Structure formats: structure tokens, C-alpha cells
Design a protein around this ligand. Structure first.
Ligand code: CA
Ligand code: CA
Ligand code: CL
Lengths: 366, 366
């Protein structure tokens, strides 16, 4: 195995394929990347046994085919540390891989390619293309509502659902839910899969900001996304996502509309004096007005009064203010609409201008 | 106590007297700020018992004199959380302090001003004024050489020394030393004091890079710095400080000169393959060339060769790379000069083109 490549052709690929890796790896091979030279191309692969990210790098200087694995973060730091435009030459030598650029020389310890984990081949059931921007919208709109380490495995993931001309994402942690749907311009079979939380992070990481479209393929147990010269593949979370469609409030008649940033800043201040553990705030809605109040066990109190659009019955309802702030922070909009039912029922929140995304937050005791 | 003030006028004072972002102050009153209205001014005071920061704001709107202490972080967050342009009206009300701006209202728990700590009256023995930028340069050139935070050395602050027309700072952790001296335009008595590590950080935090005179007053047991409308006071550390004159290598017979950036990048790269828990490199100096090498327990090896100016016998010497990198980062210059003696003696490092600061570094055995 031998190649020589300019530093910057290697740097973004290396940065990307280190993502599946941790601090200390569970076992040494998992802290390595696989390097393969075949058909004029260097391919670099990182894996965590659940997903893999592969980057392909065209080679325009002389090379010899072969494969090995080397410590990912050491190899990346070497490459990042060399001067702009350095030429980096690599040669496999059994138990070590040698790297040379100008008069800088490194020897890294290898483990055999044959021993690098190789996710199994699989068959796609659906395939589509979409703008990178659409995928970014779909993930950003919902990612925050994923569980961080729930007992219920299925909540530590994001649902992707194709249905007709729409792609939709759903995330929930048992307490709040987010759902976003976007037009695909393509007619698709009904599919519903759970992408693992690390997979979602990686999908996000791989989007650059260009009009290279994203190509997605979904199978019974796996998903793959190709952008430019990067291909991400993950196994799916085996499980049935709960049916959130039956969780959206049925007849949520009390409509409040207000400025998103005005609400956000008001909640943000009220939160200072909320219980630091339980984070409860009280909303009192009345004719064209919202009053937000917080207090903590030490009897400190905040109160914010805002003008809003509201004509329903007065009601008072408590919410975890961090859940509310997460939604307002995800909505990127001028005005928000909250749809209320009664003091013991969840609220649905949406951008006033769009039904693309909906958020449901269960209320809390105070 | 009653005052009304622009949020604008409070932001920097609150930032100064408040943080120390975090960290959990283990003695509850110390996480409070003392507010005082008297002779047309609001004064805000933060303290940790060892030091204190006082900020003053002029009050042009109707105000009434008085006390109180309130939670600093809470009060800062509320002020910071209000809209640009806000006016903040405050009225003390027994066990609560009311803060009101627009239709935002807060009531904070108070503790009695009379419970807030001291600090007692002390007498200056030396006073001078210097540009705050001169103080900034002196601390920044040397701060990094102080021991940390249990390390548990014996010396836990920076020496401030007045001699002739210069102010000088010296910091050492027993392995490396930094010294910087700046002229201050006034002839001064010979005086030497130790400022505690956390005092040095707070002092540094107060300084702006504006042109602004800084007035310093040093007593037997305390130091005070006044810039603008902020006054910082710290206790001093008792006991002896080593004499930097006695640590400076007495007769170096080996002179290395090299580009500061090239040297830094070469140390940084070799260091990738040094032992992680204890990152050192070996330097081998010979005519016109510097070879830097590193290796780790996995028997990975790095070698960097640089062209340099070098006069002296061939020699091999090892260094802890963080100590050297810290010096090159502090110099921020074109070329550096290293003055060497032998494999087991300290080196001196300085900017080849200025003599305001000098660094002494002990070698490593590898
Ligand atoms: Ca495979
Ligand atoms: Ca005092
Ligand atoms: Cl497995």
C-alpha cells in the first residue's frame, strides 16, 4: 500500500471519518481507521460496529494498492499539524505505516485490514434523492427531543418515515415530542425506520452546505446516505416507534399566537427563578394576554406579562420551561402558535406560518 | 434602597463583580453581591474573602440610599436577560428586593448588608500608576509559569517587583520560570510582593486593552488596583520567593536560533507520538540543524528536522513539550533564541529581537 496526497485532500475526509470513534475505544481496532488503495482511490472508513462512514479520496500522484488500519486521531493530528499544501506520503510496512512530509517522519502501529469490522451487505427497499438542506431542516427540527439514554431503547433514536411525496422525522423522550414533514418531489413507498442517535449526529455532520444532493437508501435493517464522496451507513434500531399520530391533541381549540423571540426571552427570564431541578413555570392565558410566572422552593418569584392573540377561555397550566425553550429555540420563526386544551392536557406548538413542524409538550405538576 | 438605572450601565459592572462563572461557592454569602446606594452612586461588591471587586455606577434618576445583598448570578442573569434599552427599577422591601423592567417583575431573596464580609482597612506602602496595557503585558508574559492548583508546590502566586523605573513579574513552578520587566516612567523603591494565583487571574480579568491609567497600591499584606470605576483588592501571600537572578543560566556556551512558528509546529507534531501521560521530546543539536524526536509505549516514533542557526558542541537534551510550547506561545514572535549549557542544565529562551521577557526551562530525562 503506498500513496502520496496533498494535505487538504486528506484533511476533511479524515475529520469526517473520525466521528464514529470515542475517547478511549472499547478495543484498540475501534480507535483505528481502515485505509484502502484500490483503483486509483484511497478510501478511509471509521466504524463503531453500528455505523460506518466511508470517504473516498481521488489519487493523482503514483500509488500502490493495499490496505491497513492505523490510529484515527493520531493520523488526523499528524495531517492537521503539517503545513498548508504539504505533500504527505504513506507507505505500509507490515506492523507499521510510515508517513513522510518534507523532513517530518512518523511511524504508526497497524492492525490488519482483515480484522477491521465490516458491516454486512444489505438490500435497499426504497431510494430517493433530496437537497442536503431538506435533510438538515428535518434533523434540526426534531433532534433535541430525542432521549438522552432512556431505558426504552426505541426513544434513543429518530424515526424516519417516507409516505407518498413526504419525508418525515419524529423524536420523543416520553415527555415531549417533535415531528417535521417535508415534500420530496418523489412518490415513495411507506417505510418507517429508527435511526440510532449517534447515526443522526453523523448524518448531520456529513452535510456541508452545497447543492450536492443527498441520496438515501433504506432497507429492512439498514440505511445509507451518500453526499459527494462520503457514504454513511448505519444499522437501524430494531423496534416499533410508538404511534405519535394518536398523541397529537385531538381538538386543541384555544389558539394563542405571539412573537417567537418575545415569548422565548420571557420564558428565558422566568426560568431564572424556577425550581432548578423541576423547572416548572405557570402560564395564565386570558383575553389577549399571556402571564408567565415562576417560583422556586425559596419563594423567589418572576412574572412576565406579554400581549398575545388569544380569545379562548382563561386557563392556567404548568410546563417544564426547558422543554418550552427547546421548542422555541428550534422554531426559527417570526410568530408561534400554541394550541391548548385544558390544564391537564398537552400543548401543541407550531410556527404560526407553517404546519411543517409540530411539537407537543406534556404539562407538569405545580 | 431604591434606584432606577439603564441595564446598559449595569452589564459590565455585574460581569466584573460576578464571575468566576460557576463554580458553586461553598460559603453561601460569597455567592451574593452587596449593593449600596450612597452619594449618588450604586456600588456593587463581590468577594471570596481573599479578594474583592468593587464597581461603581453613577445614578442620575431619583434614588434612595441603602443596602442589601442578593444572589449575584441570579441578578446578573435577570439584567442580562432583559432587552437592549431596558430600564431597571429596584426597590428593597424587607426580605425581598424587587426588580422591575417593562412588564417583567422579579423578587429576589436578600441577606443583610451587615452580614456581608469586611475586608478591613489596610495601609499602602508603595503606589504607582501605569497604563493598564503595561500590566496586561507583564501578566500575560508570565502567568502560565505559575504552578497550578495542587500541583501543591509551595509557591502559589506571582512575584511583583519594583526596581528603579521598572515593574517586573516572575512566575515559577519549580520546573520552568518566566520573567518580564517593563519601564513605568517613575523611579520607585525596591519592593517585592507575592500576588496569589486567583488574584492574578481576577486582576487580568479587569484589564481592557483600552489606554486607561491603572493605579496600583501595595501594602505589607494587600494589593489594590483601580482602573476606571473598578477597584480590585487582594491579600498577598506571605513568605519567600526564589531569586530569578540565581535561576538564570550563568554561562551558556551553546546558542540556537530558529523561526518561532516553525519550531512550535515541529514540537507540536513530534508531540503527537510522545507518551500521552508525560509528553516529552528529544532535541539533538548539531551544526545548522535541529532534530526533534518522540516515541511512545506502542513504539510509534516521530522525527522533525529543522534548519537553524547553531553555534556550539553537538548535544542531546530532552524537554517536556508543554513547557516549550507555552514559551513559544507567550513570545508570539518571528525568531527565538535558546541558550544552552549541557544535557542536564536549564535552558534560557527569549525572542531573538526583544529582551523584555526571558524564560528558563529545566530539561527532561527520556
Ligand atoms: Ca461492508
Ligand atoms: Ca473594606
Ligand atoms: Cl453487534
Amino acid at each position: 500500500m503506498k500513496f502520496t496526497v496533498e494535505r487538504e485532500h486528506l484533511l476533511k475526509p479524515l475529520q469526517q471519518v473520525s466521528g464514529p470513534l470515542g475517547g478511549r475505544p472499547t478495543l484498540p481496532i475501534l480507535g483505528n481507521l481502515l485505509l484502502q488503495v484500490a483503483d486509483g482511490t484511497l478510501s478511509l472508513t471509521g466504524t463503531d460496529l453500528e455505523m460506518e462512514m466511508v470517504a473516498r479520496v481521488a489519487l493523482v500522484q503514483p500509488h500502490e494498492p493495499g490496505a491497513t488500519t492505523v490510529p484515527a486521531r493520531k493520523f488526523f493530528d499528524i495531517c492537521r499539524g503539517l503545513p498548508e499544501g504539504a505533500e504527505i506520503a504513506v507507505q505500509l510496512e507490515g506492523e507499521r505505516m510510515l508517513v513522510r512530509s518534507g523532513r517530518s517522519r512518523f511511524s504508526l502501529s497497524t492492525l490488519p485490514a482483515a480484522d477491521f469490522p465490516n458491516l454486512d451487505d444489505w438490500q435497499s427497499e426504497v431510494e430517493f434523492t433530496l437537497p442536503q438542506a431538506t435533510m438538515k431542516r428535518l434533523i434540526e427540527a426534531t433532534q433535541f427531543s430525542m432521549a438522552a439514554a432512556a431505558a426504552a431503547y426505541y426513544l434513543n433514536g429518530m424515526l424516519f418515515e417516507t409516505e407518498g411525496e413526504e419525508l418525515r422525522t419524529v423524536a420523543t423522550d416520553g415527555h415531549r415530542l417533535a415531528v417535521c414533514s417535508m415534500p420530496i418531489g418523489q412518490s415513495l413507498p411507506s417505510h418507517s425506520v429508527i435511526v440510532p442517535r449517534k447515526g443522526v449526529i453523523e448524518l448531520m455532520r456529513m452535510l456541508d452546505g452545497g447543492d450536492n444532493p443527498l441520496r438515501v437508501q433504506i432497507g429492512s435493517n439498514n440505511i445509507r446516505a451518500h453526499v459527494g464522496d462520503f457514504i454513511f451507513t448505519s444499522k437501524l434500531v430494531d423496534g416499533r416507534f410508538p404511534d405519535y399520530r394518536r398523541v397529537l391533541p385531538k381538538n386543541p381549540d384555544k389558539h394563542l399566537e405571539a412573537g417567537c423571540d418575545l415569548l422565548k426571552q420571557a420564558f428565558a427570564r422566568a426560568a431564572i427563578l424556577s425550581n432548578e431541578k423541576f423547572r416548572g413555570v405557570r402560564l395564565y392565558v386570558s383575553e389577549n394576554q399571556l402571564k408567565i410566572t415562576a417560583n422556586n422552593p425559596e419563594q423567589e418569584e418572576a412574572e412576565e406579562i406579554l400581549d398575545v392573540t388569544y380569545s379562548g377561555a382563561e386557563m392556567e397550566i404548568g410546563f417544564n420551561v426547558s422543554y418550552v425553550l427547546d421548542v422555541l429555540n428550534a422554531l426559527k420563526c417570526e410568530n408561534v402558535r400554541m394550541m391548548l386544551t385544558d390544564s391537564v392536557s398537552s400543548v401543541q406548538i407550531e410556527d404560526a406560518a407553517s404546519q411543517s413542524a409540530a411539537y407537543v409538550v406534556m404539562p407538569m405538576r405545580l
